[PDB]
Amino acid sequence: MSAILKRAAKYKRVSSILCEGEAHLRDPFTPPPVILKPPAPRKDKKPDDITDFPAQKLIPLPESIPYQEGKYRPASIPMVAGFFPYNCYLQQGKVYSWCSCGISQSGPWCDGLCNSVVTRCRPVVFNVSQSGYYKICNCKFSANAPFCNNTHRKMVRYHHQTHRGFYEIWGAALFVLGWVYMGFNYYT
Amino acid sequence: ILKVARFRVLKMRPKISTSYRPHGKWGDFLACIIPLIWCINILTNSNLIL
Amino acid sequence: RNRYWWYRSLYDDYVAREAKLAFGIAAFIWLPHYYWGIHLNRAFEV
């Protein structure tokens, strides 16, 4: 206490934002951070006292989110559900729901399973101006909400950089190389 | 075995199994490839000795 | 392939971590068996 207070004058604090940024900058539906100050402490504490803290804005879960034009931060971490984009034929003027959670059984589209999982990832309801073949994102991490922007390559590289992912890929590679070695030594 | 022997008891990170029923994608197909190969093997060998 | 398809094909149960860790160890436990089998096959041929 006294020893800490002696050196507390020179101590400098550091920001708590690391590798996450600000959610309100990259994501709508999230109000900017607000500093709430407590009221004066209650004179008497009663067993039936509810909180007296200032109220906080409550945003309900949207049924679906619009197409955020190249600026899409997932509300929660989704299941990857594949590192390759789908090549799907989208009809002009037809409303499509894109699965953001990634647990949909109906391919890239929402189905209904986002309501059966604890996540804030809501489907991206979008409409294309012209029918044609589009690269629908299947890793659920692309900045383009329903489309692929080659983020899955970065995801694969990051997975390979991790210790466990490095071990997994090298183990699969050595399994295949063992098969190849057996095929090469089949005549000895 | 390691997982169930090290991380599935109550005092070591159990799981809240919230699934009512299973929904599978070609279950038996994966569980019958390994036996079928065996069958093939056995059959072939028998035929040769026969 | 399709990660979601291959992560719940086995009766909606997830054993993918143990499957992934199985290849690395399984890449080396077969070497003594393979070499002694080579020896046995050569003996049978002789």
């Binding site: 089949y186 | 093939i40 093997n41 072939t44 | 393979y34 096959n41």
Partner: peptide
């Protein structure tokens, strides 16, 4: 079978 004897 195909490569049952492996060698």
């Amino acid at each position: 079978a195909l490569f049952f004897m492996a060698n």
